[PDB]
Design a protein around this ligand. Structure first.
Ligand SMILES: *[C@@H](CS(C)(=O)=O)[C@H](Cc1ccc(CN)cc1)NC(=O)[C@H](C)NC(=O)[C@H](CC(C)C)NC(=O)[C@H](Cc1ccccc1)N=[N+]=[N-]
Ligand SMILES: [Cl-]
Ligand SMILES: [Mg+2]
Ligand SMILES: [Mg+2]
Ligand SMILES: [Mg+2]
Ligand SMILES: [Mg+2]
Lengths: 240, 204, 244, 243, 219, 224, 241, 196
């Protein structure tokens, strides 16, 4: 055993394309639809719990993950790749930030750290890029509420609202019509549930949908991240 | 021999009503020999002030180190560091040399720009935080400053009342220490103005 | 073994070119145009964002213009992630220099350093180069106002006005036509926006598709101030110069 | 295609062709066998006499590990030696820490994990040997056989090399005709016979028989080579059975 | 420093004084010595203060990451192990002397952790320079399976014993009550000493200090 | 650098006409405490060598394993392991001597004095000493620690030079050794009555004698 | 076409080496099944000893990882043992560092994160195995968690693995659709094993003797495998009703 | 500290006092010095509490991992792992450990590991500061193949004396019985043993 792959597996082709990044983006395209919407007093992120079998307990598989008390993440693409990014994001939020400054990182900086990890898989020796796009929603004291997208390249963009994966082209058009700068959090959740219904084929309820918010503090502070329960989603589906 | 009392000097910080004050002497020596009477011990990184007593090479080193770190902090965060955050940074930085420490006695002072709350703090040489509202003292005449501050201080002083309190605490403590004095500086810090005054004191 | 899968990123072609550098430049040619113009009393950085939707949060967005220290800024063309790796390295070199000499880093020294890093990826290590071209806008008390560019090869050069990214051929002709040595910042602002307005692949140039910045000594008591323009300010300067 | 050019590559079947090519080297080698008896194990091997210039009884193929384990292999002989060297390091470190001599199942996995490790990367070649090994531990006798893939199982009898099918058929008869079990001295005789019968597959050249054994009663649980009178008694028994 | 803990019927009561000293001088009269490890586990700290603060912070941080990955509340034994194995590795040079108390899925647990990496699992413990004063109170009055308000009183009484009789200890009494149903962080629980009242005003009047020069800069 | 904790005392030995004798008491002292009364300090290697060890007992147990391991390793790929390529006293000694000096040179010694007694392939008597410093020497009589001061003087009266070895029978040599063990028991405060003795003869082979005792003890003059 | 030889993306966004490792999974031609009782978790697997020379006692694809955790493997035995040794090591290290027994799901996630690494790093191949972990967790109760070559993992109410997994899966799905509960409502593990065997017989359409099965049972504070005679007793009870 | 392990007919019994002192202060008076490294392999600890705890935890780990791979380890194997740690780290450790365990094959076995890192297999073993005072008593009163009740009384009387004379020892006498029947924990309070 010598890890002899000390050379890049992602290289520029004659056209200027980075093949493996483009292919990672194709993998993200095949993945299940997830979206994020930013309100004035909160952010919402949502995705479909695509259950691999009905015998499988889909509650154990969390697509929406808490990174810090005030930051949450969701993805489209390869689940195992997402899982290890969440592990590293949580850790970097302690090592390179909380242990130094005594507080959690702001959304943009934690996003920047995740982006860095994904960029390194795009240039380091003997690795393929991550096959996921992330949507990171968060709050911090000086920037307020924010929503970011992070791609396999390591590129990240802030969004008012967006969607990624399967039905993202159709979902982004749907959001463009419904979004305004005076949405309340409940209005954004309502729009998220509408937008997500278009891309879902089968059952559409609290057990097949995962949805979380960055909002008010839930009782030093309380955490602004909150994952909505199966019951809380179903209640809002009756007013749909 | 004792690194914390080769070069000498002192720092004191106090809170007031919507203000903080931090002050220091100007002496640098080699034990008995006085060398410089222009060695200031208070530095600032944005609106957060940092006094540092102790071994002067470490004072200079830590100043340069916190300037470095707070500059990168500002570039990344897109905002100036706050006193509460900086205090934690100092503590971390000091403790990462736990078994070969900087021979220093730092003192943070500043006003939180968002909340408006006056903030001070102190540390031992390995970064344990003294987090007191009233006053923080440091240096070769720390005992003297503790005595002066405990009897002179009272809460919620106006900026120019506080000036007289901190100045008299510094001056009278320094005059009972061989290795402190040779001049003094007092910063009066308010939410959006800072007054720096040099004091007239005995030059022995 | 592994040799089978090795692209060999650090080799010459038979013509004496570095394959990956050339292909990285091809990558950069598709990136949004960035322009730097140096006047006697300041420097302008202007750059065009790309793809953009109505839903992109512009005021908290930074893909083109970054700050290295209080005296030096960069405009980016290429992979934004790659640039951010290099930017954080540059930001450290400036602070290491400040810590060592107690003076701000001279612009050329910082530029050489980054450029030397880029060069290293073309000569050793077997890794792909950084798909980034920088325009460095900066000031120091030796040479005053300076514009530089670097590219994936690690080669850097000084300029009075320059473009990188898309349509640089067209952009450089238009700048070469209208630039003059006695020019001032307000005029250079106008030249930069007029050049982008003609070279853009979009239908029209709007505030939401631009990042903009100036480095002026034009401040009270002869000190250098960096101004990264806010969305509303870019909209005002577009109306002022008469583009919208 | 190209899936067979590199080790540790899955073909579209789910196979590692380089390992299967290592098996071809094993099948090309001389016959070796193992027989589990009442209180121990017997190992035997066919040694092809390429020339008259080979010194008889000198080029020994069966190797001892620790003092209680015998190893024999078919295929690339140096690869077998490399594996036994590793086995000796494993058995040594086990005894150093845990005091007791390494158990045979414990030892079997040590080799197994090491051989399997050489199917995980393209920077190494798989082992070109099937290895038959075993001995006596606190839980009694154990016979194992270990393939290039890292696969191994416990056996009543084992056989590998060019004469494996011939040998296997003979081993299967012994298993059927002796359900109550085979004695250690019986197993030495039977081992000789089976190597002699399996020599029909390598019949061009003549050969030299080499036998070893561990038995709780006959060798005090230690690995010993069958020598002199007992070896000749086994050769005579084998020569009688072919005629 | 006087820190103490007891196991009572429903859970754990931790206690601590509030005097932080440098040599003979009191630097802080109200300094917090009860630290957060996890939501169900707290740690009283004695010995070298920096070591106490940073050791608890690091194990708290690592337990947070552990608890995020497992998705369940951390246990006192894992807090105990992580502190223990670290302190042992550093052979006593990290001068952290902790009273670790918390409530698990397996019930309430109380530990004393020493700088060298030894731990005792006990129904009551005391540490710091006032441990003997506090331990006298526990040997006098402790019994197993106490009610909450009784245990609160016993710990408070033990910390008080340290406050008055030990010079290293002083200030207020902090408690931390941990059970399955709640966490009560009581700071301060008691103020056994009033701040000494000063009879004169010694503050100087404006213009009394002699200034050489002045500078004003706005922000 | 360490200090020895549980210790063994004198190992004594001599050459005679056909071979060598070696002996050592069965005690593991723990300072002044006579802690362990069943410790074997003569450790045979094959049928032609006995290694007698004094000093630290944990380090002796380590050396015991190194020798046990050496036998195993010599048997590997060695068809003549019980014949021409068996371990020799001189091989076993040189190994130990290398180890002892290597360890002292890393400032981490095995805290022992060792005597390797045996008979070689060609019938030659082998008797050589090595200690924690790597110091080696041979003599017709060898003894470690206390025995060097009391056993050697008595044993040298039997074999004073090389030319006395052929004149000394096994009975005379064994009597001398057993006599010396009695003298050591009277006078060594860290010795014991119970001992082991080993004869390695070129004809009769290795004879290992356990549970011997010092007897014929003169105490009667005490009463006066 | 070197995108099929190592773990890098094909133009479709696919990792062919991961997919081919999934195919290696069924190379043994063995079907496993796992179900949960009230107090227990039962795992059964087909046992095939084709050679008469094999010692049938050493032919096993069920592993005792810790005292509480059992692991059945669908895939070749060398990769199975690679995974078994690592899981054992991880479970022991966990107990040392953190002072309590490694939970079933935490191990499953750990092994899954390792499996993920082989799908991203080029020098390491994926293991051609599916790992089904079982325990009676002291917090979560009866637990079934499964890991594959992709690095995916998930908890199960019940599961099945192998060539005929879909038949077994649908058989189990249909039973739980009737009962409307996540488990086998049964007190004794003996009867949960009888259920597991019965529903495999129905799904596969094959009768079993004592030597054709291999059974693992997790209870509170221990996981154990059944002997041939313990299984025979189980088969007698099935036949008698 | 006063600790001992004694083999008898049905197996082996470990015994210990419960006092841990910091100088003259009794830090813990109810210490459990009998610690379990496997089902029926236990150890008595003496020396540095930090060291003996750290060792015992490492041993437990090694024997847990041994069991996962090779089944139940022998008592000899446990003693070997203890030894390996104690011997190889003798310069940085102060640990005097008695190892005791019950196999069905070997029955009761006692191994003592003193400061050096040497191993000694014995019918019974005594250790700790209080052991000095009972060498005489234990030697005179120990017999092989005692009954369970005789061995409990032998340990109780012995440690009673060790406690009486040694200030470093005291509190309750804990015992752990290891037989085929299982694992039994016994405790004996001052009011019982002092009047012996
Ligand atoms: C009481 C501990 S005692 C007297 O040993 O029982 C107390 C506990 C305590 C205080 C503060 C906190 C804060 N979160 C937590 C726990 N500890 C002390 O009083 C302790 C001895 N004091 C300090 O550590 C002190 C804190 C300063 C902020 C005043 N720092 C020092 O005394 C350093 C110590 C030191 C120097 C060099 C090397 C190692 C340790 N003093 N100095 N210099
Ligand atoms: Cl992991
Ligand atoms: Mg003075
Ligand atoms: Mg003077
Ligand atoms: Mg791979
Ligand atoms: Mg006593």
């Amino acid at each position: 055993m010598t890890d002899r792959y000390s050379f890049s597996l992602t290289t520029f082709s004659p056209s200027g394309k980075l093949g493996q990044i483009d292919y990672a983006l194709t993998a993200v395209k095949q993945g299940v639809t997830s979206l994020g919407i930013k309100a004035t007093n909160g952010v919402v992120i949502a995705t479909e719990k695509k259950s691999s079998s009905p015998l499988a307990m889909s509650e154990t598989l969390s697509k929406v993950s808490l990174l810090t008390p005030d930051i949450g993440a969701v993805y489209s693409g390869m689940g195992p790749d997402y899982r290890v990014l969440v592990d590293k994001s949580r850790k970097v939020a302690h090592t390179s930030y909380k242990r130094i400054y005594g507080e959690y990182p702001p959304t943009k900086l934690l996003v920047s750290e995740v982006a860095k990890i994904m960029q390194e898989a795009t240039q380091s020796g003997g690795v393929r890029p991550f096959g996921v796009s992330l949507l990171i929603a968060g709050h911090d004291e000086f920037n307020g509420f924010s929503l970011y997208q992070v791609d396999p390249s390591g590129s990240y963009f802030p969004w008012k609202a967006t969607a990624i994966g399967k039905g993202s082209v159709a979902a982004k058009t749907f959001l463009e019509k419904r979004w305004n700068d005076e949405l309340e959090l409940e209005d954004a959740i309502h729009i998220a549930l509408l937008t997500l219904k278009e891309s879902v084929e089968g059952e559409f309820n609290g057990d097949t949908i995962e949805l979380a918010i960055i909002g008010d503090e839930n009782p030093d502070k309380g955490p602004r991240f909150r994952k909505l329960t199966s019951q809380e989603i179903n209640d809002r589906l009756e007013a749909l | 021999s004792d690194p914390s009392s080769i070069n000498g000097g002192i720092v004191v910080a106090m809170t007031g009503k919507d203000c903080v004050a931090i002050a220091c002497d100007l002496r640098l020596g080699s034990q008995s020999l006085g060398v410089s009477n222009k060695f200031e011990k208070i530095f600032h990184y944005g609106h957060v002030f940092l006094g540092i007593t102790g071994l002067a090479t470490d004072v200079t080193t830590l100043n340069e180190m916190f300037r470095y770190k707070t500059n990168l902090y500002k570039l990344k965060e897109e905002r100036a560091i706050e006193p509460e955050t900086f205090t934690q940074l100092v503590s971390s930085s000091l403790y990462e040399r736990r078994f070969g420490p900087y021979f220093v006695g730092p003192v943070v002072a500043g006003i939180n720009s968002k909340s408006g709350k006056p903030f001070i703090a102190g540390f031992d040489l390995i970064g344990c935080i003294d987090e007191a509202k009233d006053f923080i003292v440091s240096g070769t005449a720390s005992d003297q400053l503790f005595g002066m501050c405990e009897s002179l201080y009272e809460p919620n002083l106006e900026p120019e009342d506080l000036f007289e309190t901190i100045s008299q605490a510094l001056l009278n403590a320094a005059d009972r220490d061989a290795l402190s004095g040779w001049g003094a500086v007092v910063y009066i810090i308010k939410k959006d103005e800072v007054v720096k005054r040099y004091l007239k004191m005995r030059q022995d | 073994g592994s040799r089978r899968y090795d692209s060999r990123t650090t080799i010459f072609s038979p013509e004496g070119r570095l394959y990956q550098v050339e292909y990285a430049l091809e990558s950069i040619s598709h990136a949004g145009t960035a322009i730097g113009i140096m006047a006697s009393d300041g420097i302008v950085l202007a750059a065009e964002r790309k793809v953009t939707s109505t839903l992109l949060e512009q005021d908290t967005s930074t893909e083109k213009l970054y700050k290295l220290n209080d005296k030096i800024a960069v405009a980016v063309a290429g992979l934004t992630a790659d640039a951010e790796i290099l930017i954080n390295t540059a930001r450290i070199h400036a602070q290491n220099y400040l810590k060592t000499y107690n003076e701000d880093i001279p612009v050329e020294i910082l530029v050489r350093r980054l450029s030397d890093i880029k060069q290293g990826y073309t000569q050793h290590g077997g890794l792909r180069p950084f798909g980034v071209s920088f325009i460095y806008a900066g000031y120091d008390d030796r040479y005053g106002y300076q514009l530089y560019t670097s590219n994936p090869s690690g080669n850097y050069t000084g300029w009075k006005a320059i473009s990188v990214g898309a349509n640089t051929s067209a952009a450089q002709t238009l700048l070469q036509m209208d630039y003059k040595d006695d020019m001032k910042v307000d005029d250079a602002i106008e030249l930069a926006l007029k050049t982008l307005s003609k070279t853009t692949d979009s239908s029209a140039l709007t505030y939401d598709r631009l990042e903009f910045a100036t480095i002026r000594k034009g401040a009270n008591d002869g000190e250098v101030y960096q101004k990264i323009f806010k969305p509303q300010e870019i909209k005002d300067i577009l109306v002022k110069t008469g583009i919208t | 295609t190209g899936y067979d050019l590199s080790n540790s590559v899955f073909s579209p079947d789910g196979r590692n062709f380089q390992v299967e090519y290592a098996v071809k080297a094993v099948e090309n080698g001389t016959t070796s066998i193992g027989i589990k008896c009442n209180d121990g194990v017997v190992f035997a091997v066919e040694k092809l006499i390429t020339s008259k210039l080979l010194v008889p009884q000198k080029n020994v193929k069966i190797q001892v590990v620790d003092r209680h384990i015998g190893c024999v292999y078919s295929g690339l002989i140096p690869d077998g030696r490399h594996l036994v060297n590793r086995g000796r390091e494993e058995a040594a470190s086990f005894k150093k820490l845990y005091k007791t001599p390494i158990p045979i199942p414990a030892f079997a996995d040590r080799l197994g994990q090491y051989v399997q490790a050489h199917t995980l990367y393209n920077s190494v070649r798989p082992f070109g040997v099937s290895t038959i090994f075993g001995g006596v531990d606190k839980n009694g006798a154990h016979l194992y056989m270990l393939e290039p893939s890292g696969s191994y199982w416990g056996y009543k009898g084992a056989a590998t090399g060019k004469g494996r099918q011939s040998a296997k058929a003979e081993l299967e008869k012994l298993v059927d005709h002796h359900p109550e079990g085979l004695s250690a001295r019986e197993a030495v005789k039977q081992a000789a016979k089976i190597i002699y019968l399996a020599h029909e597959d390598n019949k061009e050249k003549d050969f030299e028989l080499e036998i070893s054994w561990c038995s709780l009663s006959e060798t005090n649980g230690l690995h010993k080579f069958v020598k002199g009178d007992l070896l000749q008694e086994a050769i005579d028994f084998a020569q009688k059975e072919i005629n | 420093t006087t820190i103490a803990g007891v196991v009572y019927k429903d859970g754990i009561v931790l206690g601590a004084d509030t005097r932080a000293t440098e040599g003979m001088v009191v630097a802080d009269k109200n300094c917090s010595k009860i630290h957060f490890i996890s939501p169900n586990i707290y740690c009283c700290g004695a010995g070298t203060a920096a070591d106490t603060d940073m050791t608890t912070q690091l194990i708290s941080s690592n337990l947070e990451l552990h608890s995020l990955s497992t998705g369940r509340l951390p246990r006192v034994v894992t807090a105990n192990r992580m502190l223990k194995q670290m302190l042992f590795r550093y052979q006593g040079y990290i001068g952290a002397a902790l009273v670790l108390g918390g409530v698990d899925v397996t019930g309430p647990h109380l530990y004393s952790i020493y700088p060298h990496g030894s731990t005792d699992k006990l129904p009551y413990v005391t540490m710091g320079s006032g441990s003997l004063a506090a331990m006298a109170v526990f040997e006098d009055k402790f019994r197993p399976d106490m009610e909450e308000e009784e245990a609160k009183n016993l710990v408070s009484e033990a910390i008080a014993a340290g406050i008055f009789n030990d010079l290293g200890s002083g200030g207020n009494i902090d408690l931390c009550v941990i059970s399955k149903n709640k966490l009560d962080f009581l700071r301060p629980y008691t103020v056994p000493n009033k701040k000494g009242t000063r009879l004169g005003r010694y503050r100087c009047e404006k213009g009394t200090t002699a200034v050489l020069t002045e500078k004003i800069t706005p922000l | 650098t360490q200090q020895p904790i549980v210790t063994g005392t004198s190992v004594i030995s001599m050459k005679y006409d056909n071979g060598v004798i070696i002996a050592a008491d069965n005690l593991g002292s723990y300072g002044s405490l006579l802690r362990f009364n069943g410790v074997e300090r003569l450790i045979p290697v094959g049928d032609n060598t006995v290694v007698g060890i004094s000093g630290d007992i944990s380090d002796m147990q380590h050396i015991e394993r190194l020798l046990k391991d050496l036998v195993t390793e010599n048997a590997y790929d060695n068809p003549l392991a019980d014949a021409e390529e068996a371990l020799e006293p001189s091989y076993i000694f040189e190994y130990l001597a290398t180890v002892m000096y290597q360890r002292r040179s890393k400032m981490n010694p095995l805290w022992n004095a060792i005597i390797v007694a045996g008979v070689q392939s060609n019938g030659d008597q082998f008797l050589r000493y090595v200690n924690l410093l790597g110091v080696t020497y041979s003599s017709p009589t060898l003894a470690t620690g206390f025995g060097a001061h009391m056993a050697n003087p008595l044993l040298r009266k039997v074999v004073d030079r090389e030319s006395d070895i052929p004149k000394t029978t096994v009975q005379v040599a064994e009597e001398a050794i057993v006599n010396a063990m009695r003298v050591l028991y009277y006078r060594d405060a860290r010795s014991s009555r119970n001992f082991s003795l080993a004869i390695i003869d070129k004809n009769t082979g290795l004879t290992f004698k356990k549970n011997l005792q010092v007897e014929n003890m003169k105490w009667d003059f005490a009463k006066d | 076409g070197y995108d099929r030889h190592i773990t890098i993306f094909s133009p479709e966004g696919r990792l062919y080496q991961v997919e081919y490792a999934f195919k290696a999974t069924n190379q043994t031609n063995i079907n496993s099944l796992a179900v949960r009782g009230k107090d227990c978790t039962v795992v059964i697997s087909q046992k095939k000893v084709p050679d008469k020379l094999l010692d049938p006692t050493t032919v096993s694809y069920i592993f005792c990882i810790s005292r509480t955790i059992g692991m059945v493997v669908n895939g070749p035995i060398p990769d199975a043992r690679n995974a078994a040794l690592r899981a054992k090591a991880e479970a022991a290290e966990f107990r040392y560092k953190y002072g309590y027994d490694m939970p079933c799901d935490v191990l499953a996630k750990r092994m899954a994160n390792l499996s993920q690494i082989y799908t991203q790093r080029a020098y390491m191949r994926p293991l051609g195995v599916i790992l089904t972990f079982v325990s009676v967790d002291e917090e979560l109760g009866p637990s079934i968690y499964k890991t594959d070559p992709a690095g995916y993992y998930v908890g199960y109410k019940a599961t099945a693995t192998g060539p005929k997994q879909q038949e077994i899966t649908t058989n189990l799905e249909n039973h739980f659709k009737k009962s409307k509960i996540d488990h086998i409502n049964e007190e004794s593990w003996e009867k949960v094993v009888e259920f597991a065997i019965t529903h495999m017989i129905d799904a596969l359409g094959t009768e079993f003797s004592k030597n054709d099965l291999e059974v693992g049972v997790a209870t509170k504070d221990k996981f154990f495998t059944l002997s041939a005679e313990n299984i025979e007793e189980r088969l007698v009870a099935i036949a008698e009703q | 500290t006063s600790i001992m392990a004694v083999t008898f007919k049905d197996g082996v019994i470990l015994g210990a006092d419960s006092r841990t002192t910091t100088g003259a202060y009794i830090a813990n008076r109810v210490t459990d010095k009998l610690t379990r490294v496997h089902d029926k392999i236990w150890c008595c600890r003496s020396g540095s509490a930090a060291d003996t705890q750290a060792i015992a935890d490492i041993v437990q780990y090694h024997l847990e991992l041994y069991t996962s791979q090779y089944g139940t380890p022998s008592t000899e194997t446990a003693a070997s792992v203890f030894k390996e740690l104690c011997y190889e780290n003798k310069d940085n450790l102060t640990a005097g450990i008695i190892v005791a365990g019950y196999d069905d094959k070997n029955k009761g076995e006692v191994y003592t590991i003193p400061l050096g890192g040497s191993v000694h297999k014995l019918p019974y073993a005594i250790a700790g500061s209080g052991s000095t005072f009972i060498y005489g008593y234990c030697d005179k009163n120990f017999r092989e193949n005692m009954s369970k009740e005789e061995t409990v009384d032998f340990i109780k009387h012995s440690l009673s004396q060790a406690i009486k004379w040694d200030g470093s020892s005291g509190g309750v006498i804990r015992m752990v019985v290891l037989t085929a029947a299982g694992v039994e924990r016994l405790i004996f309070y001052p009011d019982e043993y002092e009047q012996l």
